[PDB]
Design an enzyme around this catalytic site. Structure first.
Site, PDB file in Angstrom:
ATOM      1  N   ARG A  54       0.832  -1.380   0.059  1.00 18.58           N
ATOM      2  CA  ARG A  54       0.027  -0.073  -0.074  1.00 18.58           C
ATOM      3  C   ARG A  54       1.005   1.183   0.215  1.00 18.58           C
ATOM      4  NH1 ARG A  54      -3.873   2.983   3.881  1.00 18.58           N
ATOM      5  NH2 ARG A  54      -5.843   3.018   2.552  1.00 18.58           N
ATOM      6  N   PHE A  59       1.510  10.627   1.866  1.00 22.28           N
ATOM      7  CA  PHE A  59       0.914  10.156   3.312  1.00 22.28           C
ATOM      8  C   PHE A  59       1.888   9.190   3.601  1.00 22.28           C
ATOM      9  CE2 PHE A  59      -2.536   7.482   5.698  1.00 22.28           C
ATOM     10  CZ  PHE A  59      -2.101   7.701   6.735  1.00 22.28           C
ATOM     11  N   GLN A  62       3.440   1.693   3.022  1.00 22.29           N
ATOM     12  CA  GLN A  62       2.978   0.332   4.011  1.00 22.29           C
ATOM     13  C   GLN A  62       3.760  -0.859   3.625  1.00 22.29           C
ATOM     14  OE1 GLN A  62      -0.847   0.441   5.502  1.00 22.29           O
ATOM     15  NE2 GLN A  62      -0.523  -1.647   6.677  1.00 22.29           N
ATOM     16  N   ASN A 101      -1.192  -1.503  12.885  1.00 20.63           N
ATOM     17  CA  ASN A 101      -1.955  -2.503  13.935  1.00 20.63           C
ATOM     18  C   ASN A 101      -3.347  -2.519  13.572  1.00 20.63           C
ATOM     19  OD1 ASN A 101      -3.483  -0.248  15.343  1.00 20.63           O
ATOM     20  ND2 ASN A 101      -1.476   0.424  15.985  1.00 20.63           N
ATOM     21  N   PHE A 112       4.853   1.336   8.479  1.00 22.61           N
ATOM     22  CA  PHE A 112       4.641   2.254   7.552  1.00 22.61           C
ATOM     23  C   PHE A 112       5.923   3.262   7.598  1.00 22.61           C
ATOM     24  CE2 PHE A 112       2.470   5.683   9.909  1.00 22.61           C
ATOM     25  CZ  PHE A 112       1.999   4.971  10.910  1.00 22.61           C
ATOM     26  N   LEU A 121      -2.026  10.347  13.977  1.00 23.07           N
ATOM     27  CA  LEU A 121      -1.392   9.137  14.408  1.00 23.07           C
ATOM     28  C   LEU A 121      -0.855   9.133  15.919  1.00 23.07           C
ATOM     29  CD1 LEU A 121      -0.100   7.956  10.969  1.00 23.07           C
ATOM     30  CD2 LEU A 121      -2.605   7.721  11.769  1.00 23.07           C
ATOM     31  N   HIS A 125      -0.347   4.814  17.206  1.00 27.41           N
ATOM     32  CA  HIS A 125       0.728   4.125  16.543  1.00 27.41           C
ATOM     33  C   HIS A 125       1.829   4.243  17.028  1.00 27.41           C
ATOM     34  CE1 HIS A 125      -1.975   2.725  12.865  1.00 27.41           C
ATOM     35  NE2 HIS A 125      -2.630   4.025  13.154  1.00 27.41           N
TER      36      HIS A 125
END
EC number: 5.2.1.8
Length: 164
Positions: A54, A59, A62, A101, A112, A121, A125
């Site tokens: 991904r 952004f 991942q 997660n 990521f 986040l 995370h």
């Protein structure tokens, strides 16, 4: 003292370049060690040959799903999941390495690399490392992503291990 780990990145099998990461073992020892061991493969499984499934430009990138290659798999060296260690470190800008997660205390092997500041986040995370060399390679990886995260070419970790 903090370990440095490298990924060699390929794009449809063609060598792209190398990214190295410092892991903040001083601040998140259990989380850093999981990533370090998965990068050397010294426990018999890990990231070598796995893909970045991904990539969302502007952004993050991942990866780390080495068992189902699509975001539904992976496992830690401590079992299927492990706890959120702490949230000392924040998502302060591009180059931050943070754990994916599935809710509280569900860390496995997915991670990521942030390519932007992602403050929303923080506290959700676990941040555990940062790009040391090769941010330009991560930026190059971004160009193969898309708005929905699907990549236009196969982005793989062709080799990986520990540098220091």
């Amino acid at each position: 003292v903090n370990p440095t780990v490298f990924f060699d990145i390929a794009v449809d099998g063609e060598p792209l370049g190398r990214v190295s990461f410092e892991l903040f073992a001083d601040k998140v020892p259990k989380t850093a060690e999981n990533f370090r061991a998965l990068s050397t493969g010294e426990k018999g499984f890990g990231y070598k040959g796995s893909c970045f499934h991904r990539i969302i430009p502007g952004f993050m990138c991942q990866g780390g799903d080495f068992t189902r290659h699509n975001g539904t798999g992976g496992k830690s060296i401590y079992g299927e999941k492990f706890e959120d260690e702490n949230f000392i470190l924040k998502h302060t800008g591009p180059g931050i390495l943070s754990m994916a997660n599935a809710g509280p205390n569900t860390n496995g092997s997915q991670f990521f690399i942030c390519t932007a500041k992602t403050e929303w986040l923080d506290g959700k995370h676990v941040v555990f490392g940062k790009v040391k060399e090769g941010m330009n390679i991560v930026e190059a990886m971004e160009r193969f992503g898309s708005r929905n995260g699907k990549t236009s070419k196969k982005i793989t970790i062709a080799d990986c291990g520990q540098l220091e």
